[PDB]
Amino acid sequence: WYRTFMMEYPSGLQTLHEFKTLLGLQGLNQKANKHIDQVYNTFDTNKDGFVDFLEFIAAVNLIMQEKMEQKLKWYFKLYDADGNGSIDKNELLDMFMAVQALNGQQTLSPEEFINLVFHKIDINNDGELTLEEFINGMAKDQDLLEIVYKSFDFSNVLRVICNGK
Ligand SMILES: [Ca+2]
Ligand SMILES: [Ca+2]
Ligand SMILES: [Ca+2]
Structure with missing residues (x-):
């Protein structure tokens, strides 16, 4: 109960x-x-x-949740600070900061991170991960996913x- x-x-x-x-x-x-x-x-x-x-x-x-889909939508809304439905390079930047704020995070330095992350996940290269890109991105790329997970x-x-x- x-x-x-x-x-x-x-x-x-x-x-x-x-x-x-x-x-x-x-x-x-x-x-x-x-x-x-x-x-x-x-x-x-x-x-x-x-x-x-x-x-x-x-x-x-x-x-x-057994499924990660829900948890991802969560991390997404959580990082989509200005809730404009999209995660821009800044929001993701902070996202990385915080991860690196409660972890001395291994070489990945924002500059590095934010790009690798965007190359892979920013499907239509608009400079913003949509919900689709982010969830899907993070999913089929279980490397950067540990960076997300580290956030929470x-x-x-x-x-x-x-x-x-
Ligand atoms: Ca309450
Ligand atoms: Ca946003
Ligand atoms: Ca995009």
């Missing part, structure tokens, strides 16, 4: 702070942190600052929920 949520959060609400703690994401630097906060936000849908059971379930549904360790998350559960 997913009211093992109530076990951890007797008040009925989980807060951004507990979130970080629960996920070890406590103590990050300015960027690595600010980012974790961006993540937490996408889950607290009713933007009230807490993650209540309803937002909570929506999150675990997405986490336990799903599974690490799945491990922790489906453990002390």
Whole structure:
């Protein structure tokens, strides 16, 4: 019964702070942190600052996802900062930054990364990965996919929920 949520959060609400703690994401630097906060936000849908059971379930549904399609749409909306339906070179840049902000990321330096990533994934070379390009791109190119994953360790998350559960 997913009211093992109530076990951890007797008040009925989980807060951004507990979130970080629960996920070890406590103590990050300015960027690595600010980012974790961006993540937490996408889950607290009713933007009230807490993650209540309803937002909570929506999150675990997405986490336990067996299929990666959903998780990718998630990373996509998450990086498509200006939500213009597209991910430009900047948004992806930051995306890389944050990954490199909570990881001393191995040689890939934005300059390098952003291009390799764009060459491969930017199918119609418009300079923007569409949802189609991004999902499909990241999918059939499991190399840069680990860079994405690094942004938000799903599974690490799945491990922790489906453990002390
Ligand atoms: Ca909320
Ligand atoms: Ca955009
Ligand atoms: Ca394109």
